[PDB]
Design a protein around this ligand. Sequence first.
Ligand SMILES: [Cl-]
Lengths: 35, 198
Amino acid sequence: XTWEXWDXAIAEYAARIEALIRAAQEQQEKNEXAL
Amino acid sequence: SGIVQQQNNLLRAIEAQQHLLQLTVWGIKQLQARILSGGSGGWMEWDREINNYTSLIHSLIEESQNQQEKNEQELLGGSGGSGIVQQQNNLLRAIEAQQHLLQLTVWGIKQLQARILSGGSGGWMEWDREINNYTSLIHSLIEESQNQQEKNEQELLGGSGGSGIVQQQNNLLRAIEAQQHLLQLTVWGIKQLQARIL
Ligand SMILES: [Cl-]
């Protein structure tokens, strides 16, 4: 109920990180277009 | 979306991973106050080193942010291969500092788990293996990035190193991915301990 706040913050950074990694990977497979 | 833009995304990943990590640190300190009595057994040093690497990574992130703005300001000059390579060095250093923090949080979770739970049940034996595996994988990616970095710094002087730069983007990205798995393993461990003892 802070721990379920904590577990909120973690899952909603986790979602942001997953989106960034996915975007960077789908940039990387353009970089390897450039190559 | 171009190397500079992808660099922006790596940096944002790193920053978001550092906020996630600081949340794990908070979890661990809550557990530590229930389970342990003072800074014996390495804990005073743990606290000090959490603080020292946190301050170092804050400072590396601030430097990477300034290099990022500089690279973005100069996109039309064409010329900054060296700005891109510099930002690769910055991101690698941040990743390495993050990895020291992660290893400290892993050590903390292990020390606390050993006092309250058998190592042999509840997913803990798989946890131990996965921790070991990803730690090895991350170290290998960091070593490969360091080697690629030295090589890229050489090629830039000569004919060119565009290929080396794209390869280094891949290295850093994979390191960040692997660190996200480690972070998720540390979150799991903290939740098991919290369910047990809080
Ligand atoms: Cl962001």
